Amino acid sequence: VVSQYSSLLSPMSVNAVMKVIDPATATSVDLRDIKIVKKLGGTIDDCELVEGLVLTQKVSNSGITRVEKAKIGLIQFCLSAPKTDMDNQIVVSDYAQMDRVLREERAYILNLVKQIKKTGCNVLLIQKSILRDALSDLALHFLNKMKIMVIKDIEREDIEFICKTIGTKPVAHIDQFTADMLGSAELAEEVNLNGSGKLLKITGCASPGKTVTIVVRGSNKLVIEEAERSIHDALCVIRCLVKKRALIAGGGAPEIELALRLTEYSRTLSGMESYCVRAFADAMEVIPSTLAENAGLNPISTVTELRNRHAQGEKTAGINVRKGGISNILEELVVQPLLVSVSALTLATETVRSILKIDDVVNT
Amino acid sequence: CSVYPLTFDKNENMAAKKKSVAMHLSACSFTNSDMQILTASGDGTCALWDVESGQLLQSFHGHADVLCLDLAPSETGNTFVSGGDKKAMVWDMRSGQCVQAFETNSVRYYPSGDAFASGSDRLYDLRADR
Amino acid sequence: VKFRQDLMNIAGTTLSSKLLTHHKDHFTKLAVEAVLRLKGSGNLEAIHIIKKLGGSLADSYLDEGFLLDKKIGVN
Amino acid sequence: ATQQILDEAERSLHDALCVLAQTVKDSRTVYGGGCSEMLMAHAVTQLANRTPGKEAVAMESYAKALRMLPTIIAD
Amino acid sequence: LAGEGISVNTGPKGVINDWRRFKQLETEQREEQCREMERLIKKLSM
Amino acid sequence: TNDGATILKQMQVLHPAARMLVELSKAQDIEAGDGTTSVVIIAGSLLDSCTK
Amino acid sequence: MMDVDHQIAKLMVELSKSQDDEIGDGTTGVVVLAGALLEEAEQLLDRGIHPIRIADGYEQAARVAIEHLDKISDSVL
Amino acid sequence: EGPLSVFGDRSTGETIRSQNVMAAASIANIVKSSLGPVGLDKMLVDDIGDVTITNDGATILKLLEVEHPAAKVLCELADLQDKEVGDGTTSVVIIAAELLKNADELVKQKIHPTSVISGYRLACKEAVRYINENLIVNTDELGRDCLINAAKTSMSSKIIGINGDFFANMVVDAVLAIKYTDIRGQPRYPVNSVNILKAHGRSQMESMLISGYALNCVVGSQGMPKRIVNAKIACLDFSLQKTKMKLGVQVVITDPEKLDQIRQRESDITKERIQKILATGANVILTTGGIDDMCLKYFVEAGAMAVRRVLKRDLKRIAKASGATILSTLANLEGEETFEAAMLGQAEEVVQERICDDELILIKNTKARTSASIILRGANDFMCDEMERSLHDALCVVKRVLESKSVVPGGGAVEAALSIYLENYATSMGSREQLAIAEFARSLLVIPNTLAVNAAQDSTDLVAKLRAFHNEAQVNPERKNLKWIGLDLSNGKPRDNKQAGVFEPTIVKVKSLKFATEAAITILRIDDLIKLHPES
Amino acid sequence: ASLSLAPVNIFKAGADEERAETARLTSFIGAIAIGDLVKSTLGPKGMDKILLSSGRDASLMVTNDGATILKNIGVD
Numbered sequence A: 001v002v003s004q005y006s007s008l009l010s011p012m013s014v015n016a017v018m019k020v021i022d023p024a025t026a027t028s029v030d031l032r033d034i035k036i037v038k039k040l041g042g043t044i045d046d047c048e049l050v051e052g053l054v055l056t057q058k059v060s061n062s063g064i065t066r067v068e069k070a071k072i073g074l075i076q077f078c079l080s081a082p083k084t085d086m087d088n089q090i091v092v093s094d095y096a097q098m099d100r101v102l103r104e105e106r107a108y109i110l111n112l113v114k115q116i117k118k119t120g121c122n123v124l125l126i127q128k129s130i131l132r133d134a135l136s137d138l139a140l141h142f143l144n145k146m147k148i149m150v151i152k153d154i155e156r157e158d159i160e161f162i163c164k165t166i167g168t169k170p171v172a173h174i175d176q177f178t179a180d181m182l183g184s185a186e187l188a189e190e191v192n193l194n195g196s197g198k199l200l201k202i203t204g205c206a207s208p209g210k211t212v213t214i215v216v217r218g219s220n221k222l223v224i225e226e227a228e229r230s231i232h233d234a235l236c237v238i239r240c241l242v243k244k245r246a247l248i249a250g251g252g253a254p255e256i257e258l259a260l261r262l263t264e265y266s267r268t269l270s271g272m273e274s275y276c277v278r279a280f281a282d283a284m285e286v287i288p289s290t291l292a293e294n295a296g297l298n299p300i301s302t303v304t305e306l307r308n309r310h311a312q313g314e315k316t317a318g319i320n321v322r323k324g325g326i327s328n329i330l331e332e333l334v335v336q337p338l339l340v341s342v343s344a345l346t347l348a349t350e351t352v353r354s355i356l357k358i359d360d361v362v363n364t
Numbered sequence B: 001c002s003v004y005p006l007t008f009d010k011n012e013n014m015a016a017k018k019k020s021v022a023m024h025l026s027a028c029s030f031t032n033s034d035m036q037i038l039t040a041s042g043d044g045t046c047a048l049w050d051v052e053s054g055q056l057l058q059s060f061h062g063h064a065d066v067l068c069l070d071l072a073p074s075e076t077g078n079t080f081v082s083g084g085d086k087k088a089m090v091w092d093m094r095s096g097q098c099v100q101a102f103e104t105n106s107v108r109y110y111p112s113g114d115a116f117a118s119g120s121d122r123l124y125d126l127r128a129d130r
Numbered sequence C: 001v002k003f004r005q006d007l008m009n010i011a012g013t014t015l016s017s018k019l020l021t022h023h024k025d026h027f028t029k030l031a032v033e034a035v036l037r038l039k040g041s042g043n044l045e046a047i048h049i050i051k052k053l054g055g056s057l058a059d060s061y062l063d064e065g066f067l068l069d070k071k072i073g074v075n
Numbered sequence D: 001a002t003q004q005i006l007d008e009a010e011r012s013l014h015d016a017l018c019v020l021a022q023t024v025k026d027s028r029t030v031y032g033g034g035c036s037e038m039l040m041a042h043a044v045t046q047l048a049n050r051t052p053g054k055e056a057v058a059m060e061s062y063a064k065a066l067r068m069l070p071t072i073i074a075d
Numbered sequence E: 001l002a003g004e005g006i007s008v009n010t011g012p013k014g015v016i017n018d019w020r021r022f023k024q025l026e027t028e029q030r031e032e033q034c035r036e037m038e039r040l041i042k043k044l045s046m
Numbered sequence F: 001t002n003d004g005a006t007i008l009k010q011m012q013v014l015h016p017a018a019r020m021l022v023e024l025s026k027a028q029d030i031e032a033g034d035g036t037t038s039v040v041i042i043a044g045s046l047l048d049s050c051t052k
Numbered sequence G: 001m002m003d004v005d006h007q008i009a010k011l012m013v014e015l016s017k018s019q020d021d022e023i024g025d026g027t028t029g030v031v032v033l034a035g036a037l038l039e040e041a042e043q044l045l046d047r048g049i050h051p052i053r054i055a056d057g058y059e060q061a062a063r064v065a066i067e068h069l070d071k072i073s074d075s076v077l
Numbered sequence H: 001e002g003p004l005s006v007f008g009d010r011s012t013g014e015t016i017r018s019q020n021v022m023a024a025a026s027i028a029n030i031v032k033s034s035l036g037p038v039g040l041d042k043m044l045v046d047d048i049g050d051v052t053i054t055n056d057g058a059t060i061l062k063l064l065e066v067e068h069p070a071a072k073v074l075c076e077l078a079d080l081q082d083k084e085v086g087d088g089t090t091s092v093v094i095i096a097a098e099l100l101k102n103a104d105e106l107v108k109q110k111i112h113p114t115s116v117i118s119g120y121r122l123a124c125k126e127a128v129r130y131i132n133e134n135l136i137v138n139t140d141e142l143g144r145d146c147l148i149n150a151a152k153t154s155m156s157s158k159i160i161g162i163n164g165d166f167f168a169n170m171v172v173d174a175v176l177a178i179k180y181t182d183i184r185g186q187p188r189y190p191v192n193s194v195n196i197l198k199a200h201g202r203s204q205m206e207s208m209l210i211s212g213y214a215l216n217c218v219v220g221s222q223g224m225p226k227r228i229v230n231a232k233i234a235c236l237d238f239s240l241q242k243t244k245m246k247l248g249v250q251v252v253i254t255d256p257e258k259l260d261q262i263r264q265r266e267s268d269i270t271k272e273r274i275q276k277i278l279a280t281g282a283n284v285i286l287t288t289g290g291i292d293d294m295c296l297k298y299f300v301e302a303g304a305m306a307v308r309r310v311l312k313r314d315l316k317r318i319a320k321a322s323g324a325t326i327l328s329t330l331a332n333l334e335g336e337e338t339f340e341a342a343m344l345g346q347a348e349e350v351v352q353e354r355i356c357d358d359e360l361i362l363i364k365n366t367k368a369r370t371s372a373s374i375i376l377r378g379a380n381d382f383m384c385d386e387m388e389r390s391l392h393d394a395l396c397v398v399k400r401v402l403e404s405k406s407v408v409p410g411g412g413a414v415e416a417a418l419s420i421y422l423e424n425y426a427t428s429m430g431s432r433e434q435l436a437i438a439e440f441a442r443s444l445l446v447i448p449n450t451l452a453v454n455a456a457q458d459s460t461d462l463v464a465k466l467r468a469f470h471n472e473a474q475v476n477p478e479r480k481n482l483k484w485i486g487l488d489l490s491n492g493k494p495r496d497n498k499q500a501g502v503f504e505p506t507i508v509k510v511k512s513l514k515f516a517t518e519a520a521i522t523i524l525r526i527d528d529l530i531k532l533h534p535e536s
Numbered sequence I: 001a002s003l004s005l006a007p008v009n010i011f012k013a014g015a016d017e018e019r020a021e022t023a024r025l026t027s028f029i030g031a032i033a034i035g036d037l038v039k040s041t042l043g044p045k046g047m048d049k050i051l052l053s054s055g056r057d058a059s060l061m062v063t064n065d066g067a068t069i070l071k072n073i074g075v076d
């Protein structure tokens, strides 16, 4: 469905794939390095390629939404009252112990926040915590009073992605929280999508290590789902090109060439196998027929013209929907990686062979 | 059967965090130490999860479907009894094996620890397997 | 050498009736190497079979070392 | 290519590994293709030919089943 | 699931007592329903 | 959706051959990511020829 | 004698009855021939040919076949 | 059931396309009668006797129960238009349905859906370009009257329509009051910060625009004063109750003589906090949490107003307007517990006003920032709710006009001009996309047609006259002033809408066109439906 | 393909058909059952049968004749 936007998505997909791999060394692409974020509203023309990190979590602070020259810190412990792993209670026997406990808890929280601030941190990411309040209200007040953006409820599964993106080493104890363990960035701000939600984008990092984020926007949810599926398909195609550096013509040319060559091969296989190979070639002759039928053309004449032209000697000849006939398909820039066709053939043949070995169905 | 509402309708009493993802349920029961949750399904497998990290520590399959789970409180790792099959089975999660079995819905572990009730639809001494 | 040939033949005969008969030679070499790597131990659980979708059946192989399906820490 | 293909390949490989491990444990081998079945049936027939009474008929039926197994193989 | 051809035996003979016990009540119900349907539907419809 | 894998997964096919075709689509998506419709079309044509 | 319900099956039965009425023999060959013709037509339709074109081709091929049968026939006393 | 053996129904070909067009046309015809100043409102009974009288398209489509997913696509399209623009909710639905109908009509003639989609995309892009290049009016050359005219145009077809001469001024003043500048010097208008309170009673004319803020709350205790002449507002985000230790703290008494002192401290802590707050001179205390009785008595004796259970957003707005600071806790950076005078807001007056047998708090003339609030008076609750919806639409329209300084003539002038331009433009673009662009242009004419039909006037002749005027404007270089000619629904004749003061924000038309085109493209892309039977 | 195992059904309700293996199985089963029933009444030392009618009359018949045995049996 995203064809009128292909002029925007194709360079975006190529840039996304190139930015997460090393072209001179990589033999495979890990698509988990390309995060796709779907936000309702706007139009697919508003899809953006974010070099940094995009977080859907909202800022707990109020009044602080834009920080320049940020020093993002990733925290895996809780900023609340002390609570050991062992079962613990505080026993009060005198009236002075009450406000002593209150004052000591306040001092503990203040010391934690001061230690965090001393490193120069100004943006704090707090990992999601259970069985213990990750961010106390008093802790949030102290953090706000020292001008630090606070983002909490960070998912555990996103820690690796965040560390890869902005170069922050996670901190689990306040003793090891130091400035050199933070992750510098050019800008970290929260933007609003024209009254359709808020996104936190950290764009510009000192160490942008092999990670990119893709923002997908659309009018309704169904078109957004289809757009992200299509973007994933484009990324997978570029991944195939990375794995196997081979290109083949499209528009039904490989299938027609395969049918012709396999017919010629079957003509030299006298026996009962010649019929089977001829049937294989005739079955491979189906994809161009389907392309011609969907294009609104006459499948018979179109397919026989393809076969005749391939027999002539030109193998880069396929369906030309734009022209409405048969011509050289490379002029239409319709190409696909060889891995797609090879895998399709191999997997389909293996599935058919497995099917042919079945002769009974038993209901358990 | 008992499922508490979604929003918790409170004012951040540091208990609104509940996980309760329910990725497995017929015998969900919190353990002695709250860091682990034990749940069972109709596939005949008993699943142990760590509530903090949030992933399945190790699954237990030795049965048909399992119905009732009871845990003997000791580190939450010592033992837990399953009586889902007509086969009361006791597992140790320091080894992940069925330590002992009794081929005989509402199994209850006795507070003493030497026996456990096996109410179905008996006081089985663990020291004598009878 | 005779024992290795007998192992080859036995694995081939066992795999002849199954769907692996398409690549019987490759799979027979595969199984014989996998069993011989046990150094005489009967522990069949020491051999781990990982089923990954996609690819051809002939793409199956025995790793010269070992493969784990876990994750490394963050830093 | 399919999950069913992977499961069947795993089962076949498990069969091959188990048979190879058993052969490693005990290296005695016999010929397949119905050779062992026909040899056992021939021995049973030889025993039956020297046995009087309906026990001979029972032995002949036993040998008939033993020969029927490779008959099913050929069918 | 074979051997359908059975021709049965005196087994049904051994259960003629209960067969007739139920069949007499069934026949009485059929007679009552036949006397009821001689009018109902036969004239109610038109 | 226009994706072959998604189309075959979303609708609950019941015949075993259709289930194996769905698994074939999933495998093609895993290994390549494109051509998921073409592989199913090829398998269907191959079996259609196998009929005769 | 079949208890068919499909309309095309009834058409096949009528075809057999017609062959029996006109000739009296060959009531089984007609059904097999029609089935084979419709199978080939199914293949052609899957390839994308209008059914009327298939019917016209079948009609002219039948004309050719009838002419050939007349040609290769032999007379008996 | 066939060779597929899927547990569900399947529709393919023209059947599913016709079904989708039927659903879209049903959704359109639901709201077509409520478009334009001669439009009429609708009742909605919620199966339990609840009544909703409205003219807003988004509300109508949200309250309705829709089953066909194309009807849903249209409903969420209207909701998206409401969220992102705030006006033109009915227009986008009508345009999308007409576009889909004409696209299906093209497809039935064996025109491939790809060609229709490409033509629609090209027509939408060219229509946006033409609107931005030839149909925009800069608001800097019109002044305040442009804002009033835009608000009045928005208020037409609403229950505050005829009384729009009075409501437009109130909306403009309210929007201009909450204006504030941010970084990079780009003024922004946080509309929906103008609190709207509904209270039946007097006529619509008696609607009051508060030069401050209005709280739908009352004082906690009857003993406190109900008016402060110099407000020192202190905003708190915590409850003022008896102190209770946390879950991890237990009180174990071994010496019985300490229990009384502990119990005394349990309340003395809150007493000390309240005394610290009051010692700075605060007159008004607003808190999001509750307040116990004795804490209220402290303010009673101090002669200070105290309001409890204040909404968080209301507290934020009050703190921003009055210059106060929200304090979730009393704790400085020295580890102590103090309250400074710098955390106090200031207002000229805080009054417990009475409005139709109910009371509310008015914070009048806040300093360091100007705020606004509107109290709507009507016959009953339904009328007040419709007033609130129309007022929100007008506020959004004024916000769009102030943000983007371009406006377009109303009354279908843009639609007719675009239809003429696009039908002339289609002849110079491709061969198969020509029909798609022509059908896009013809589908754009549904808006003036609907207006004229609602007026019960000659739609054909009126639309023909509009098209003739716009054609003359487009082909004659010296008659370019006819671009502004729209529809005068009162008299049923063409009229210069720019001179008549019928304006709309350009963003409304642009976003309507884009969203409608995308929805039509999404629905048109379908050619087969599989509906799996429910497993239950 | 076959009429019974086809994606579309060509039969009235209650009408079915049995293909090669199934038809042969049913025919052989019926023939063997009939032969086993009628036998054991063959030769000088053959025994007789009791034909207990299930009708209202409930006619009782003790016979050795195979034809009479085969006549008065409900055969499907």
Ligand SMILES: Nc1ncnc2c1ncn2[C@@H]1O[C@H](COP(=O)(O)OP(=O)(O)O)[C@@H](O)[C@H]1O
Residues within 6 Å of the ligand: C012, C013, C014, C015, C016, C017, C018, D032, D033, D034, D073
């Ligand atoms: N290549 C072969 N040639 C002849 N006979 C074979 C061959 N492979 C296997 N067999 C015979 O087939 C029989 C069944 O083997 P198989 O089907 O592989 O496993 P299972 O014993 O579980 O049926 C064996 O008894 C073996 O003798």
Ligand SMILES: Nc1ncnc2c1ncn2[C@@H]1O[C@H](COP(=O)(O)OP(=O)(O)O)[C@@H](O)[C@H]1O
Residues within 6 Å of the ligand: A250, A251, A252, A291, A318, A319, A320, A321, A332, A334, A336, F004, F034, F035, F036, F037, F038
């Ligand atoms: N512009 C084009 N002209 C001709 N053929 C095309 C064009 N674009 C795609 N095709 C063909 O359409 C076939 C289907 O591709 P597509 O639907 O994108 O993915 P899939 O192969 O998974 O169906 C491809 O084999 C390709 O050769």
Ligand SMILES: Nc1ncnc2c1ncn2[C@@H]1O[C@H](COP(=O)(O)OP(=O)(O)O)[C@@H](O)[C@H]1O
Residues within 6 Å of the ligand: H034, H035, H036, H037, H055, H056, H057, H086, H087, H088, H089, H090, H091, H092, H153, H154, H156, H157, H409, H410, H411, H412, H447, H451, H486, H487, H488, H489, H502, H504
């Ligand atoms: N005074 C007026 N004269 C002519 N046309 C008007 C006038 N006021 C509004 N209109 C037109 O009536 C149309 C319907 O607007 P309306 O339905 O009230 O907005 P919405 O679609 O948000 O409900 C608008 O496109 C506008 O151009």
Ligand SMILES: [Mg+2]
Residues within 6 Å of the ligand: C013, C014, C015, C017, D015
């Ligand atoms: Mg074997």
Ligand SMILES: [Mg+2]
Residues within 6 Å of the ligand: A233, F034, F035
């Ligand atoms: Mg593709």
Ligand SMILES: [Mg+2]
Residues within 6 Å of the ligand: G025, G026, G027
């Ligand atoms: Mg004959």
Ligand SMILES: [Mg+2]
Residues within 6 Å of the ligand: H087, H088, H089, H154, H393
């Ligand atoms: Mg409006």
